[model samples]
Target: THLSVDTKFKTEGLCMTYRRLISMMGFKMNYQGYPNMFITREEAIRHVRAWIGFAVALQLGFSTGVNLVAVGLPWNVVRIKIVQMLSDTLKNLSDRVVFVLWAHGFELTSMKYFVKIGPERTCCLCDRRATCFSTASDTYACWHHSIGFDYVYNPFMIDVQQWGFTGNLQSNHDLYCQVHGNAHVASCDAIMTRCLAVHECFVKRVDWTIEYPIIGDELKINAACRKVQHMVVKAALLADKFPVLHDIGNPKAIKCVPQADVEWKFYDAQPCSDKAYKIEELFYSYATHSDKFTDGVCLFWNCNVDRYPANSIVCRFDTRVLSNLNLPGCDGGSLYVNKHAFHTPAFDKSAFVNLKQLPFFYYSDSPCESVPLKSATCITRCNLGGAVCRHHANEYRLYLDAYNMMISAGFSLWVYKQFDTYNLWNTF
Candidate 1:
């Protein structure tokens, strides 16, 4: 009884026309290629299910494998629901869906008919109005201009490549939610913000009318959009924070090479070559600030704050050696002082005249070990006595000033000022 078919000519014509209408919408009939007979209500329901799948496939470009019974639309309601589904997909997921109604079929009715007939009849009784029928071209052109369906279909075809049409907007949104759920919290807000922006656009675009009625109070589409956008930002941030380090050859290890002309000498040493001493002083006396000269005289003379030494040859004044070998001086046998730990000079003249009075200044042996109290006296008197000490000290100040100028001009000194101190990590 459920599968009975009517044999009347008019009944067969109605059935054939309905089948034709279904075919135009890309839906296949329930029974084989073409069942040209009036089918039972059950058969009609199966056709609706097939129609729903066709609509979904059009948007997704593939089958979702969704079961027919699980689609949840009854026969009477299924027709309009399919229209609404396609409407939503067009508005959010795509823009290519064209309303293709055909007049040749007996049941070729525009969707607008069902939408505009408010509270008139139930599903089977709804399309009974004779005015609902129209030819394919007239149906398309009229529905295209009508505001009744305009809310559902307008602004035809957009780039759906980025925003893919998987299922409906809800299904597409859930996919993004899964992605957002796994994103980092640090930059998740950016994604969230982007999702929110898209949702705001979606909400603004989606307005309910009799045609496209509200499905639910809330939309899953917004939630999914937010989560996906947030995860994208998080992924980008983490990628930049960590990078792979590759070893590309030795890169020719940059090394510090010693200047050959530079040399060091102490006060007791004879006046060395002006070139060697100046060059050596460039390395030593340069940037000799107040703190660097805290011992009383220039640290270049290895001055300690408490006392000064003399007669002992300047250790740094010996031949220059660098990189485990000797480097030629500016002149042969050039005397040079390699370091200084002295205090800032006051040029007190009183401190230069008497050793005991100069607590504020002093020096140490070339090794900077013990201060020779008598040697300190000898050095102080020698400088004031117009000896090499005087010449050396004066020339030292001049080089210090010149070095400051070089530094101001962006020249950098890599090494200087060897001193006696423990490694308590107190370089400052």
Candidate 2:
């Protein structure tokens, strides 16, 4: 494939299509927020995981398929793309630091978790086996979920944490601490420090207690469970209920520049070619204007993108000298002034000498707009405290959040069980 589906800029078009998709899936909209939107909570969960997992799956499959040939090892090929302006999409989102750990070559070992007290007859609060579906006769859950407190408890480690248990627990304080055992507060700092090491979270705090309440040192576990289960049902029906929960941001923090930056350079020219060097031939020429580039510029003639429809525009400048001073031995080398020189393509008023205008080409110091980052908003009180949360786009934010919640809770339960098992085995 030339690129990911994201490589194409059908932003509006995709939004429309996704809107239609959610509609077909039966997601209703709200007058105040994301009105008449289609996707269900269930659908959002499936889609978000599908999209992200699709990416990871492709990367893994390709690496495995290619490496199976025995050509050589493919370097660390994992790819993570965070939605731009991720904070906007994730309400109360925190910039929790997280790392991926892999075991048995494929299983994502841990997602980040939390643990407290000793591994006793009981384990951590967030532990999943703490629930009825699983047993804690041992410490840990089944293979389907992630293992270890690091991955299971760390809310900052996965997108779903914002949408799942922690977020839900926040709605009902008693329920949250009951599940995870109150180790901290619900502020951005507390949430990030204890959950994700996230210094920042991109959402305005919403009021959840009215609908999800905690009563006198006790949590309404049944009510919370029903609420989450309802979310699953919503997801099953509507596919785009959650929008901001999608994971599309960069993990490495590599600044993503406009595509043009990857492809072009520009120069102002009067349209003159030297006969001695020939139009298609290369020759080192001196600038008549007597600028720093005058003596050191070498023209690669036909090799320039202006002459060829394909390939990178070929040109070299001397790196040792400044742009103000003329240097001797005009071999093709780039300039190394105090700072990088501005460049642009020659296509329009001031682009580089290139033929066709490719989408990714860009010039230094060129005037162009930067792309906007991504964001999301959730209306929790949809219909006076509905179990399902809502969003604006079909980016699958809702479902992603829910899955992360279940996985985290499940993982927490699983880890606690592990210690339980270790102790049991030793006793045996």
Candidate 3:
């Protein structure tokens, strides 16, 4: 339909544009200058057929250009149409904005060109390259096949987003990792570990898109996952340490230094005699209401004797603070008492000291003495207030056993240091 009556081809003018369009569309102009008109028409029905043939061939682009020759259409028509399509497609797009250019034919070139337009040019993550795409409907297709307007995607330019999922794996993207030639483990730890070990992929759910993309290297994946695992474990351990702080949201945001490295091995053969003072020794010397020599011995003997009866005699031998008193057996080594082997060796203090935060339960032959120290039932009004009678052999044994049990369970006797007599009485 392109045609022009003007014979002059003005530079950068509409007349030149009109002529260019007509020539490009395969019409030949004939000048009829008497009336200053130009006529371009089909010379015959066969010529009209050839024109239609060339038009369709041009629409189909270069590969089909040879079909126009069968209809006797000139190669010049094909060339001009090719130039017209290229100019139009390229003029609208800048060279700087190019993604993919050049193709074997017009169709592929146009497809590549159009793919760079609109939202299709971006990925599922939005404003990213549409690289590895997946769909809930088709789980088997590769990147090129799965990506389009209808699929979940990420830019193919570089590894922008790690592999993830549209929703939680247990719900929307229910396919187990092991089911797809990957780890069967679905826990975050396992999924992440598998991703690290194999360099296969990592997964996350963004909105509803399940993005699982490859990091492409096992070592890098392993290192990254290990760092993440450490953070997770550290956070869990922190939460365990301070339960009230756990709900602060985003465990990764909470930074803390561990109070102690709990990983140290427990050595049974380590010496206990030269170790740090235990709770009772410190409390008896400082906090207890006693400076009398026997008061401290009674307190120490009372603290340990029930767990081992030999603790009573052992307390007598090493009375170092009462050393000048020439007390019985003061000169003897801990191994023998008055040329006799001391029976009942003490349990290593470390065996008790290292068991932090474990609970200690008190039991006694006397039901009145067995009540929990902090229980609501053990108050003075219960008349069991006089239960901690350290004088009676039964009462002494009860106190000693309770004290040893507390130490064994990782509690410090210092917690009971300043208690009222009645409180300690019922505490047994």
Candidate 4:
């Protein structure tokens, strides 16, 4: 069944939890009258659909959504032909992916204040102008808000209240997202859409895996982890390479922040093993080599390469008129903040200079799970048996970095050996 007991469980379970919370407050004692109650099935569906849509979107972005809808179609003849061609073409190429950045963070249900000058009034996602506001429970930020110093409404992805203020300065995958927040309002934005694949994506399959696991299942899980991780990077990079990808913006310079922190590694390796999530807390972003001036530089195709002189008004963030931005001295690229300078009180004498010095950092509200395995020190001894595996509620994961590192080491070795063999043959 496409929709199984799992779906029923999620819906019924959440409903029960809501009803229980209401009962605990003695119904009449509730402030919202059944405080946790969803107004109607429609309301509940809307809430669920938002998150579901995000999940589908991410997968589609990774795979371009073509394989997803076509996976079961009677296209074996075409699939076989394509696979054969890829098999021959891929022989000499190393599938090894270069590590770009690491992402780490936690998920929370709270508004991530992106920009804050004062109370609700001073909060602006854009610079100090392009004023806008959102009225929602725990609004992490306004989706219609701006991105950087120059107030410009980001149009790439839909900014949900739960997505929060976030971004990716470094990227494991090419496309990245960044978010920000203040005590009152939080928001997030992307560095560039040039790296995005647009509506051309599909997923062949879903990989599922657990968070923390024991040694035995580590290798199996880690391999899967690497594959899905690779797919994400591959899809995004290939998307940028497609002719259409270039038409949007500077694909080469488009850099988002790291998906996770440097210390974190993807955990789950199984197809469809993990579930997607959204965040309410402050979203974060990262900086990139191409992010010298401001995100605005990426607006015009191929403009990010040019360097603007220091103190050049790269972009402006305005709270009064949440809109697009432009730097006077620079030629290409787009900026997402507000432009209300000298007038908007948010800017002091040295604010612009300071922003140039700091730059943005990518943030990940959720650290993806990978298959758990031996720590680094335990790789050679991976075959060792022990009850080290433990179950909490459900699922297992590796306990130490030593184990994960070891697996990575092995993966690296395998790659190196293959490369050496290819090199030797080519030299002949």
Candidate 5:
């Protein structure tokens, strides 16, 4: 009864608030006027019929009828009078609170479902139509020729105690609507969708007291039951019901969309090799641990092979001391060579002399050459960890690729750089 569904209302926002405040005031006044009296006698009178029907069906089997040979009407009647009266009073209060706080009629959109209190039936019996049924009973009565029962009893103690027997036994009160219809040219039709104990239950129990001049009570029980049943039925037929209710049966909360496979194609130019590198060549570069970079790149962190004349790229790393050898002793040292230099092709010292002779070297403050291909110092490259290849385009680009290897080698930086473009010719 205190479910979160109470948070919404069909009543207009201001009207709803006023209804609750006044309703609360009425509750306080009613609760105080007669500490024992829970609801207006009129309202209790309206709902007690449902309680009685529910109680009798429970206390005595639905098919058994009211006749009790073992513990006849007196003991059981007394039992039910109290039971029905208490529950009826409670439900009446519940109905009023719910009606006031929640609805004049709630929108079907905001409506949610969580209970299965509707009359039971097996879903397999969808095509089968029968009139009167309970979880344990079933009967076939169509349209007008249906069955009904009425009970007459006097006040057990004081007739109008909301938590005790209410109707005067002096008059007729309790009523049962035939499984489905009325004598006033009435007709009806219908349909739990795995539910074993699910059974048809059109036979309705209602309060028929016109004694204190109450008329709607008869239809009230019938209406309440009808309304209750309608809500559940709507759940199955409607498109958008509460996700809350569906989650009880349906497991997934969110879903994933599937996508097809994709492969990238990279064809960036390499250092000086006639043939450019394929993705396959670079992937297995580290497998041999030598100067395995056939694809114009190396993954070395210290950048040893890339910085040497053996590879002809200045792969800058940590603070490198500018170790220039004397002119006479300018033979490139083995320290600059890769471990597998015996097999790997390396740049010769003679080539280095021509390379040095070429006017490619420039100052830290000097701007690059205006032409891209004229000199290595002409095209300055960046975005490779701030690496500007200050010399040969071939070796510099290779060194840039080598410098980028640190990313794949496991050491990660807080702010990462991207290889969106692959230009690495540097200013000398």
Candidate 6:
């Protein structure tokens, strides 16, 4: 009876629906002289320990009492592991939870947002930046906001907003998280304190399917769509062993914020599921490779890399001081980070540069779920059924011509070459 009431009924009760929206929120008021206001048992456990301490500071993204003062943890040392993990997760979620106050109650509230956080390492689960995730795994992330745009934080799971029958508090079953491969080994700045065991990261776990599913979303789009679409041709088929990818299709040599006319583009993959999330949102970075510009592999530890000395002035989106970002010209063999894996800015920068530029078209933002599952006939019947618009309409034009010669002609600086060397104990 880990808290039960989740007979799952939000509308027409077969009783089921949970996008995990705070497992159903509270303090839902109505005001006509407080209609039948209730909530006593110490205001219903101070509204479930103030929504379980801001639902653990929104999974440690922080801002409320700044998640134990940003991890210094001194509310008598983590308030008994957060009040016995909140009454041991509220008495086994008291039968699917149904505390229905039937009126305004659970009061003393405080939460406001202006959206700001980072520095002292961020990734407690995304605000963008930080690459780890706790207890011998260290923690935080944003290498694709911790993989395939992770749907609502999950790892060491515990989310319960349950409290019902109201003007608020609807549903959220915390889906059913599983794919524990937070952040670990990757070291442009080595120190992602963790190792590897990803078990094919549950094939990019498509966050509890159904944005529109009929075939019960076929094997949940085979782990978030076409089996990671058959590994972008072995992760961009690594554009045939790099010569910096021989100018693949050339987004006419990257241009935008344009001084270059109508052609220029590269908001990179505009959401073909975050299409390389705008090159980690425009030249976003870390650093490494060029054989450390020929000194190579940080000359096996005793030092050869760690420079933030001079020249790199100006970078703003709204003020930030202390700086350092040479963007080491993009490196990531601890699984390509600071990242580069493109093909989806509504693609068509000349269909992967003239494979005879035939009719070969592939555009699916819901191309009516791919013209009835045959995946819009690029023939083999658009790579047939169990949809991903015929396997990304025949492998994103050879994964955007191996991302225009392995990442805008840098050939991933000769295939992420730094061939191994970690700086040790990185943080978040």
Q: After aligning candidate 6 to the native by TM-score, how far in Å is the CA of 259 from where it should be?
A: 42
Model 4 agreement with the true structure over 86-149: per-residue lDDT tens digits:
2232212211101110112111110121111123232344322222222332222232331222
1-428 per-residue lDDT for model 1 (tens digits):
23222322122212233345345434434543123323332332222111111212111110122212213445334433434444433232121232211111222222332322111121222322111212322332122222222122211111111122333233343443433331322123222222222332222211111122222211332233223222222222222221221111111211111211212222211123443332222222212422332222221121211122211101111232221111111112111111211112112222121122111112211121111122222223333334435444553344344434333322221111222122111211
Judging by lDDT against the true structure, name the best candidate: 3
The C-alpha local distance difference test score for the whole of candidate 4 amounts to 0.21
TM-score (all chains, Cα) for each model: 0.15, 0.13, 0.14, 0.15, 0.13, 0.17
- Give me the candidate number with maximum TM-score: 6
For 1-428, candidate 3 gives per-residue lDDT tens digits of: 21233543333211144345335433344442112111222111111101101112123322112222313445444333333432233222211111111111222222221122112333333443332222334222222232232221211110101123233222322232232222222122222222221121111111112221222232342343333323323322332332222111111222232443333111111113343131112222212322322211111211222121111111112222221111111011111111111222223343222122212222222343233233422223323453443333344344445445323322232111222233233433
The global Cα lDDT (0 to 1) of model 6 is: 0.23
Q: Whole-model lDDT for model 2 versus the true structure?
A: 0.21
lDDT of 5 by residue, 270-297 (tens): 2113333422222222223335232221
lDDT of 2 by residue, 138-248 (tens): 343211232221111111112222232423323433321222233322122122222221111111111112131121211332233233433322221122122111101
lDDT per prediction? Answer: 0.24, 0.21, 0.24, 0.21, 0.21, 0.23
TM-score of 5: 0.13
> Lowest-scoring 10 consecutive residues by lDDT in candidate 1?
334-343
Error of 2 at 155 (Å): 14
Per-residue error at 112 for model 2, in Å?
Answer: 23
Candidate 5, which segments miss by more than 4 Å at Cα? Answer: 1-34, 37-39, 45-428
